[PDB]
Amino acid sequence: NFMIYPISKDLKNGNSELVRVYSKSKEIQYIKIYTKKIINPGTTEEYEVDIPNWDGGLVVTPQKVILPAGASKSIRLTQFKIPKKEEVYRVYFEAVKPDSLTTELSVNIIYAALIRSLPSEQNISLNISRNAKKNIIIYNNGNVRAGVKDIYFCKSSNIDDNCVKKAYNKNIYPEKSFDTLVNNNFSYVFIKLNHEGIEKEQGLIQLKVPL
Amino acid sequence: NFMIYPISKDLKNGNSELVRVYSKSKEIQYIKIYTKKIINPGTTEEYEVDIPNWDGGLVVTPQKVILPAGASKSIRLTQFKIPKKEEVYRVYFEAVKPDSLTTELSVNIIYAALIRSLPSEQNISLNISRNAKKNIIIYNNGNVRAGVKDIYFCKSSNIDDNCVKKAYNKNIYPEKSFDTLVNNNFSYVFIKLNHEGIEKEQGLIQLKVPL
């Protein structure tokens, strides 16, 4: 058995970060590390693609770890080129047999760290639109993901108890859209954003264009 | 999270057996089940091949399970044809997303049950041979695996404290060979077999042919 930490990392400015591997067993273990970029993150059409550890936009090294009893080891993460907009990868960690059974359990635990490759000058920015049913839609026009916690739909430009508060703990990635599922005739919206990496940036009011 | 039991099953006489799935989480889970036959089991050249669940020599059903909070479910195992000699499969159980993320951990635990497809009239039988260096070699001439716990190498036909006892907890599958790594000039060997499925069958003496 083994463990990884942290379980997610932000990389920025070409600064390298570690995801570490902690031995949790009396045996020595052999861990393989491989990486997938996430296409269309946070959406319906999300999928993962295999990328080599040493030639992509994210350098992950080493790709094999020999993990002695009680030891800790590190995998280093480095942006190769800094992206204009945030990109996400999952780095997988998988124990294998050394390259070189009725009685006991077979168990294969594979851990993944979610890795965010961030742009250098971060810009959270959201746009509002309406559907076939006005059914208001949020569009990420910025260069990083927007973690939306709740949205306040108001009939006025003032936040208050009249507004209906729907909780949406959804991350919206750059150039992606979110279906709020609300087609009613509000005038303004207030997006409540999750806080990431020392950003505070609490309140966003966007005017909902009339239908 | 979820759990499986038992972790290994013997199937015999066309009698169906269960490997069960136990929900260990507050969420509902979707489990996929797929099967691999093990080629050259217990040896250097061991590898696994994908087999369909419903057309091989081992029928595994269902291949998808919807696992509600706190529930238990079953996968049924049935030999389609009974083999002349033991064959082994691994049945894998893997939670997936329903067919129809910085903050929280990504963890993919895949469990496997080792499944032995056994012949109807079981016959444990071993043969002895010598190497380039006499280096005595055990050959499984029977129709089931031989679980060898220890071997007593004697210079006489009598078991006793003169004999050197080497512990070998190795399963030797039918038509396969084991390298004892002992080239010294003994006369007899006594194989200590593990006990499987109500077999007792404790002591096997094979005469070591002179070099």
Numbering used by the authors:
A (entry chain A), B (entry chain A): 1 to 100, 110 to 220
From the reporting publication:
The CFA/I pilus is the archetypal colonization factor for enterotoxigenic Escherichia coli, a major cause of life-threatening, dehydrating diarrhea in young children of low-income countries and in travelers to these regions. The three essential components of this pathway are one or more pilin subunits capable of polymerization, a periplasmic chaperone that catalyzes proper folding of the pilin subunits and shuttles them to the outer membrane for assembly, and an outer membrane usher that orchestrates ordered tip-to-base polymerization. Upon export of a nascent pilin subunit into the periplasm, a β-strand in the N-terminal domain of the chaperone fills a hydrophobic cleft in the pilin to provide the missing G strand in an otherwise incomplete Ig-like pilin subunit, a mechanism called donor-strand complementation (DSC). In this work, the crystal structure was determined for the CfaA chaperone of CFA/I pili, which represents the first atomic resolution chaperone structure for the Class 5 pilus family.
The full-length CfaA chaperone (residues 1–218) was expressed with a C-terminal hexahistidine tag and recovered from the periplasmic fraction post-cleavage of its 19-residue signal peptide. CfaA crystals diffracted X-rays well, revealing the symmetry of space group C2. The N- (1–129) and C-terminal (130–218) domains form two lobes angled at 121 degrees, as measured along the longest inertial vectors for the two domains, with a deep interlobe cleft. Each domain is represented by a seven-stranded β-barrel with a typical immunoglobulin (Ig) fold. Although there is one CfaA molecule present in a crystallographic asymmetric unit, application of the crystallographic two-fold symmetry generates a dimer that is self-capped by two adjoining G1 strands, presenting a continuous β-sheet between the two subunits. Importantly, the Class 5 chaperones also possess several structural features that are absent in both the FGL and FGS chaperones. They contain an insertion (D1′ insertion) that includes the D1′ β-strand and is rich in acidic residues (E45, E46, E48, D50 and D55), which form several pairs of salt bridges with contiguous basic residues (K36, R90 and R185). All Class 5 chaperones contain a long, very hydrophilic insertion in the C2–D2′ loop (K164 to N171, C2–D2′ insertion) that is stabilized by a unique disulfide bond (C163–C172). Structure superposition between PapD and CfaA suggested that the function of the N-terminal conserved arginine in FGL and FGS chaperones may be replaced by R154 in CfaA, which is only conserved in Class 5 chaperones and is stabilized by residue E86 via a salt bridge (∼2.7 Å). Given these multiple distinctions, we propose that the Class 5 chaperones be placed into a separate family distinct from the FGL or FGS chaperones.
